[PDB]
């Protein structure tokens, strides 16, 4: 009898936000009378994807930080060490600088 009201508020918020944008767009509408980009952009998107999925393990670690003891801290520390080893490998090879 409170979370149902909160879910209803979320629903009307979403529905009336999209409805406001729709009515705004149609009120603007009603009145008045062979190449290739690159490969480094794909590489930086792939860096974002892989480090975001490793950041997912950090996301799930951050909620259970206290309930897992020092052994969980050690495991997340060696996880982050592997992550930073990959990042510093990427830094040192030269695949991370842009140089336009």
């Amino acid at each position: 009898t409170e979370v149902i009201a909160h879910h209803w508020a979320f629903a009307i918020f979403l529905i009336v936000a999209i409805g406001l944008c729709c009515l705004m767009l149609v009120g603007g509408w009603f009145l008045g009378g062979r190449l290739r980009l690159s490969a480094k952009f794909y590489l930086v998107a792939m860096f974002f994807v892989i480090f975001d999925v490793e950041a997912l393990y950090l996301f799930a670690w951050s909620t259970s930080i206290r309930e897992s003891g020092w052994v969980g801290f050690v495991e997340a520390a060696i996880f982050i060490f592997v992550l930073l080893a990959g990042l510093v490998y990427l830094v040192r090879i030269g695949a991370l600088d842009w140089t336009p």
């Binding site: 009898t1 979370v3 149902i4 009201a5 909160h6 209803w8 508020a9 979320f10 009307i12 918020f13 979403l14 009336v16 936000a17 999209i18 406001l20 944008c21 705004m24 767009l25 009120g27 603007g28 509408w29 009145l31 008045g32 009378g33 190449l35 980009l37 690159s38 952009f41 930086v44 998107a45 860096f47 974002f48 480090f51 975001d52 950041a55 950090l58 996301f59 670690w61 951050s62 909620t63 930080i65 206290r66 003891g69 020092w70 801290f73 997340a76 520390a77 982050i80 992550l83 930073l84 990042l87 510093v88 990427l90 830094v91 991370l96 600088d97 842009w98 140089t99 336009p100």
Partner: protein
């Protein structure tokens, strides 16, 4: 059919609609506020002019994603504001994932830039959209870790638990590295001035705002500013004291701190120049990400040390 449960539910619906209108008018009004800091009826006049103008669909484009890119740019970072609590009894979303939802919205924010770049049948606009999208990906990768510093300090994702863990000490002073990384990531993702218009190094690149006229351009024009005000709300509710103050009412305190942080954003508009693209990407990949990972490890050791 008069029942007090229906009255309370309708009052909650009224709270949702007034917070939506107040955040929309806050962005619209301090758009003019920033333009004065660089006449509140001038935005009403601008809205009338934009309403009484024809939206141009290009004849080489399609009528779906050309209009859906401003849809994303407005509504994604608009519903990002549903997370923010302004008071113990004036919140619209009390769901458990109070940080992951903002991460969803920031992840979907890149869709507007990409879809606008394809929708403008123009190679230069496509290259500019690629540059902007690469930048915002390169900063939203560690946006999550900058939020996870405070998340790990406060335990759960719920913003109520965040602002109740801010009772003894605000999270700005133990985690200043998380604060500056989140400020940098929020500047870059919302396309604020230093990490803005990456077409400055190539004349074969153009903006994605071009070929947008009337309402489809006004959607971006108000969407970036609703985004920066909800990023400021995220910032205060995470690192500063959410609704916390000695004497003045909590919503007054929240409004004062939000206003303070976007006058700080006006100071950002005034002070620093725009760095080069290679420097921006090299910064966001080499300095910010190891620093926030080290910040997470340090706050883990701290919160596991004094755990008694």
């Amino acid at each position: 059919w008069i029942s007090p449960e229906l009255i309370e539910i309708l009052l909650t619906i009224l709270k949702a609609v007034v917070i939506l209108l107040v955040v929309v008018t806050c962005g619209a009004f301090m758009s003019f506020g920033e333009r004065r800091l660089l006449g509140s009826l001038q935005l009403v006049a601008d809205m009338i002019k934009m309403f009484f103008k024809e939206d141009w669909i290009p004849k080489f484009s399609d009528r779906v994603i050309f209009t859906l890119a401003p849809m994303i740019a407005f509504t994604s970072l608009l519903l990002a504001f549903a997370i923010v609590p302004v008071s113990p009894g004036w919140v619209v979303a009390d769901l458990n994932i109070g940080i992951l939802f903002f991460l969803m919205m920031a992840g979907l924010a890149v869709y507007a830039v990409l879809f606008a770049g394809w929708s403008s049948n123009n190679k230069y606009s496509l290259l500019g959209a690629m540059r902007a999208s690469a930048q915002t990906l390169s900063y939203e990768v560690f946006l999550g870790l900058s939020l996870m510093g405070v998340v790990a300090q406060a335990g759960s994702f719920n913003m109520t638990d965040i602002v109740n863990s801010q009772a003894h000490v605000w999270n700005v002073i133990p985690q200043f590295f998380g604060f500056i990384t989140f400020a940098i990531a929020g500047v870059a993702v919302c396309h604020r001035h230093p990490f803005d218009q990456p077409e400055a190094e190539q004349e074969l690149a153009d903006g994605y705002h071009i070929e947008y006229s009337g309402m489809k351009f006004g959607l971006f024009f108000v969407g970036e500013y609703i985004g920066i005000v909800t990023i400021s709300a995220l910032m205060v509710t995470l690192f500063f004291g959410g609704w916390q103050g000695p004497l003045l009412p909590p919503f007054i305190w929240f409004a004062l701190k939000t206003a303070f942080f976007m006058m700080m954003f006006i100071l950002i508009r005034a002070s620093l120049p725009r760095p080069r693209y290679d420097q921006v990407m090299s910064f966001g990949w080499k300095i910010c990400l190891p620093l926030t990972l080290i910040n997470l490890l340090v706050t883990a050791a701290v919160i596991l040390w004094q755990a008694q």
